[PDB]
């Protein structure tokens, strides 16, 4: 239930529970990330999930936090952003998404996380599909469940992390 | 949710929100949003709102303290009113017709702080809980849509 998330008593158990939940929902790769209030110390964010390690290292080395339109969206909004080609507008954002696809991150969405004590983060989930139409159909079918999941993960994850 | 997000002014926005809450079965709502003197909409009884401020109930109401610590909803249950002041508080709320309901905390991307409170009419708490749980996934999306669009309108 969303219950065993709150009940988990360790980051490793918690991570495993959240991973299984996303997998069970039909998502492929996830990244849950959380920082405390007024922080850009991305290098020490609480990070859970199975995003490819090579992508995570590439992202940090290339300074993509400053390029990725998902990150700037999350600083402005509580609403989800789907990884639509139309959000990768500048040349640097276009190249970023090309690189993302080499790492297998082609279809997906991110839920911004904004916590009660100012925590800031994201829950990103990738979908494996034959085409974007199929991927968007799947994500829309599970979005109401995901919308609750992201706040349960935010609340319980922030308690374990900070 | 689109016509909420597309509303032109606060009065139109408030009317849409109220109707959406009624369509989910809620008779009384209060939406409040403080910036990082708040933005207030709803149809809570005016006399309750005045009493609440005058009595300084913001420092007593367990819903308020919950909202400052959590993003998860809190249902108005006896078990959350503990102190003595908190029982008197819930007794007066009953006089205003606020017996069953829940509050969704609001935490905006720009640090806005608020609440979306919704009251339901029911014969008993078990029935009220069924009513609320049956629409909670929709309410969970609504509260973030209302947060985003309301913050943009009021600030």
């Amino acid at each position: 239930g969303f219950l065993e998330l709150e009940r988990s008593s360790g980051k490793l158990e918690w991570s495993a529970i959240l991973q299984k939940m996303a997998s069970d929902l039909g998502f492929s790769k996830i990244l849950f990330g959380l920082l405390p209030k007024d922080s850009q110390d991305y290098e020490n964010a609480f990070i859970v999930g199975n995003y490819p390690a090579a992508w995570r290292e590439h992202y940090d080395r290339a300074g993509y936090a400053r390029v990725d339109p998902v990150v700037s969206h999350c600083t402005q909004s509580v609403l989800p952003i789907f990884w639509e080609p139309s959000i990768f507008q500048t040349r640097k954002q276009h190249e970023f998404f090309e690189e993302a696809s080499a790492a297998g991150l082609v279809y997906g969405l991110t839920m911004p996380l904004h916590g009660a004590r100012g925590e800031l983060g994201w829950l990103s989930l990738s979908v494996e599909a034959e085409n974007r139409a199929e991927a968007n159909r799947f994500m829309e079918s599970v979005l109401p469940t995901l919308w609750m999941l992201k706040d349960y993960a935010l609340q319980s994850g922030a308690g374990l992390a900070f | 949710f689109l016509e909420l997000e597309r509303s032109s002014g606060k009065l139109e926005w408030s009317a849409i929100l109220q109707k959406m809450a009624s369509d989910l079965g809620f008779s009384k709502i209060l939406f409040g949003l403080l910036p990082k003197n708040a933005f207030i909409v709803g149809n809570y009884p005016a006399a309750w709102r005045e009493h609440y401020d005058r009595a300084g109930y913001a420092r007593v109401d367990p819903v308020v303290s919950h909202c400052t610590q959590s993003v998860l909803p809190i249902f108005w249950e006896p078990s959350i009113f503990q102190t003595r002041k908190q029982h008197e508080f819930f007794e007066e709320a009953s006089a205003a017709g606020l017996v069953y309901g829940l509050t969704m905390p609001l935490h905006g991307a720009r640090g806005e702080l608020g609440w979306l409170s919704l009251s339901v009419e029911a014969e008993n708490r078990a029935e009220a809980n069924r009513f609320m749980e049956s629409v909670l996934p929709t309410l969970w999306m609504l509260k973030d849509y209302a947060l985003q669009s309301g913050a943009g309108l009021a600030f």
């Binding site: 969206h73 609403l79 989800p80 952003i81 789907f82 139309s86 829309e140 | 949710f1």
Partner: peptide, 6 residues
């Protein structure tokens, strides 16, 4: 319709 880009 749930896609947003701020």
């Amino acid at each position: 319709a749930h896609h947003h880009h701020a």
